[PDB]
């Protein structure tokens, strides 16, 4: 009953900082920008909740709220 | 080649005008990998008599004894050189007991 994120092309190497970041950007652009369907957005949601340290999420949650998020969610 | 080697030190020893040159040539002849031919050694003995140095003639066979590397080949050099050595008067180290 165990499973996890599969091997991904474009991110095939040891360094995985961008793989975490892109899933967070993709998830918010999946919902706010044309969030017509709930199901496909969950692929990123289970992908950055994995592979990403917790405290990074709260830091990015404050920066988004305050309007100083570097990524373009919209 | 060996014959070229022998015929060119046969000429070097014939031209050695002091006791520094004789001890310089013999240090060159025994510095080569090959053991010199018995014809070479005979000319070296004549050179020592020419510059009047008994101890360098004694060291000729001492150099050969360590160089010849064989106990019978030292006797082989010994036999052919009996006439010249006895005529000159060179004593071997063992006979001399120094």
């Amino acid at each position: 009953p165990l499973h996890t994120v599969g091997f991904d092309a474009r991110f095939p190497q040891q360094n995985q900082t961008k793989h975490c970041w892109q899933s967070y950007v993709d998830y918010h652009k999946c919902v706010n920008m044309k969030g017509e369907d709930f199901a496909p957005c969950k692929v990123f949601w289970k992908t950055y909740n994995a592979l990403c340290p917790l405290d990074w999420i709260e830091k990015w949650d404050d920066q988004r709220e305050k309007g100083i998020f570097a990524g373009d969610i919209n | 080649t060996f014959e070229e080697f022998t015929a060119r030190y046969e000429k070097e020893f014939d031209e050695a005008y002091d006791l520094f040159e004789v001890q310089r040539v013999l240090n060159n002849c025994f510095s080569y990998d090959l053991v010199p031919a018995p014809a070479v050694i005979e000319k070296a003995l004549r050179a020592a008599r020419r510059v009047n140095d008994l101890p360098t003639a004694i060291r000729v066979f001492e150099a050969l004894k360590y160089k010849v590397e064989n106990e019978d080949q030292y006797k082989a050099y010994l036999d052919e050189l009996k006439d010249v050595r006895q005529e000159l008067g060179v004593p071997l180290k063992e006979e001399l007991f120094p």
Binding site: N15 | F20, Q23, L26, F30, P55
Partner: protein, 534 residues
């Protein structure tokens, strides 16, 4: 007099000053090693109460004092300044006035280092001063700022010295000395100076970046701001791997000269020797990131760095075999310098095999940041560079000073240091293969076995150093009496087999360098009329 030593322009006096500073720093840095060994002798904090600081600070001081204040001023500033002009045939160096500032900025660095140690914080960062730990939040005092300033002073000294040696070699040679016909020590110094010239500026840039980031608020390596602490690793090690070759290349020239004088036969294939010496320096600039295997590089760059670092063994091996081929046929004179050279040939090859074992990126994941690497680089540093330093001293001191040194009391020192250093540095490879990490003051109990053995061996080497100091004292005092009695050996080349004792006494020195033909001690103005070659 003040004018002679404070206003020095003569290169030999600057060489003597370099030597004198090296021994003081050498004794200072080898006592911290004694304290480290005493602290690691048994589990638990035995001598230093519980202070993990003042342990890392001592390690940093030991490493800096041994590398930047002993080997650099002795091999390069001590031997290079005294011997390169004499073997080339130049009366002095090209820039005689910056040669003095190349030295006098070194004592200022010692003041900066000591006052850095005495400030309440200290610099417990290692000799590789990595940004995030040595930043302003983790090291909040003025300590590492003062430590950085010392590195700038050493860097400027080395750079100004390196510029001096390139110009001196290129256009201050004698009437016959074509660039093709040089002694090998001069070639080693030349290549070392060229490595220093191209490697120092990158270290200066990285170090100044670190300083500005700590005090001028530049996100150079700060994570909050887009900085990368791994860029510092590239910048530092680009000077770092080439550096491990500045400390051994002048050590190669000494061994090349030693083994062909007490073995009366010239070096086998000299042009291949200089080719191999230049190839190690050139190709060491293409292998710097093997010190960064586990930092998270790409798989394909790890393969490149694995393939490029093993090529180092091709010229290096050529130097090992060509040293064993120039002693095959000749007559061997077993003196103290020859005993040091023979020990070097064995211990440096033992170090190099472990080095090639470390060069594989797939295996280094089991041997990195352990005492395995410590045991490795203590063979090529404490047995590869120190031994050639002892061999060079015993080789040139009677010619330089004019005082002999009681042979039988020096061979005792050789044996003591041999069997003492082998005891310290051989068990380390056993501690490293079980996974004992580096830079710790106290270790799990199961590691207490070989650590005790290594701690016992440090006292032997310290006793040998004390005996060496006594040898120095007995050389300076009543050293003129050593060559009157039968305490020392006078001639470094015995007469040939068919060379009488009365002909050896008109041609005493059959040497291939001008160094051993000069008066002892050499005159202040050595060369009035230039010497002619070929």
């Amino acid at each position: 007099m003040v004018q002679r030593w404070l206003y020095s322009t003569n290169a030999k006096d600057i060489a003597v000053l370099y030597f004198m500073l090296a021994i003081f720093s050498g004794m200072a840095g080898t006592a911290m090693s004694l304290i480290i060994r005493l602290e690691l002798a048994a589990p638990g904090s035995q001598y230093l109460h519980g202070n993990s600081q003042l342990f890392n600070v001592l390690v940093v001081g030991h490493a800096v004092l041994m590398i930047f204040f002993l080997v650099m001023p002795a091999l390069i500033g001590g031997f290079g300044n005294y011997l390169l002009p004499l073997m080339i045939g130049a009366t002095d160096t090209a820039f005689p006035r910056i040669n003095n500032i190349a030295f006098w900025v070194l004592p200022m660095g010692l003041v900066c280092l000591v006052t850095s140690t005495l400030v309440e914080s200290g610099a417990g960062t290692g000799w590789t001063v990595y940004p995030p730990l040595s930043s302003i939040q983790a090291h909040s005092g003025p300590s590492v700022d003062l430590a950085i300033f010392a590195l700038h002073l050493t860097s400027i000294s080395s750079l100004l010295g390196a510029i001096n040696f390139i110009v001196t070699t290129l256009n201050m040679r004698t009437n016959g000395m074509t660039m093709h016909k040089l002694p090998l020590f001069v070639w080693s110094i030349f290549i070392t100076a060229f490595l220093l010239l191209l490697s120092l500026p990158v270290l200066s840039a990285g170090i100044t970046m670190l300083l500005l980031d700590r005090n001028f608020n530049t996100s150079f390596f700060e994570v909050s701001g887009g900085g990368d602490p791994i860029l510092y690793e590239h910048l530092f090690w680009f000077f770092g791997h080439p550096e491990v070759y500045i400390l051994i290349i002048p050590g190669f020239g000494i061994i090349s000269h030693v083994v062909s004088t007490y073995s009366k036969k010239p070096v086998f294939g000299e042009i291949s020797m200089v080719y191999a010496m230049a190839s190690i320096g050139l190709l060491g600039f293409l292998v710097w990131s093997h010190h960064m295997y586990i930092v998270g590089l790409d798989a394909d760059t790890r393969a490149y760095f694995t393939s490029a670092t093993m090529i180092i063994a091709i010229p290096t091996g050529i130097k090992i075999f060509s040293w064993l081929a120039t002693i095959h046929g000749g007559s061997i004179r077993l003196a103290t310098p020859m005993l040091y050279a023979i020990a070097f040939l064995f211990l440096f090859t033992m170090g190099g095999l472990t080095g090639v074992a470390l060069a594989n990126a797939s295996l280094d994941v089991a041997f990195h940041d352990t005492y395995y690497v410590v045991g490795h680089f203590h063979y090529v540093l404490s047995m590869g560079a120190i031994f050639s330093l002892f061999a060079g001293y015993y080789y040139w001191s009677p010619q330089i000073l004019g005082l002999n040194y009681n042979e039988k009391l020096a061979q005792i020192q050789f044996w003591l240091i041999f069997i003492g250093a082998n005891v310290i540095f051989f068990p380390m490879h056993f501690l490293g293969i079980n996974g004992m990490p580096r830079r710790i003051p106290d270790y799990p109990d199961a590691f207490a076995g070989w650590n005790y053995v290594a701690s016992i061996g440090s006292f032997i080497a310290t006793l040998s150093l004390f005996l060496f100091i006594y040898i120095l004292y007995d050389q300076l005092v009543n050293g003129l009496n050593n060559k009157v009695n039968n305490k020392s050996v006078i001639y470094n080349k015995a007469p040939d087999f068919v060379e009488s004792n009365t002909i050896f006494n008109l041609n005493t020195v059959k040497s291939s360098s001008i160094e051993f033909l000069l008066t002892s001690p050499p005159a202040v103005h050595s060369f009035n009329t230039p010497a002619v070659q070929s």
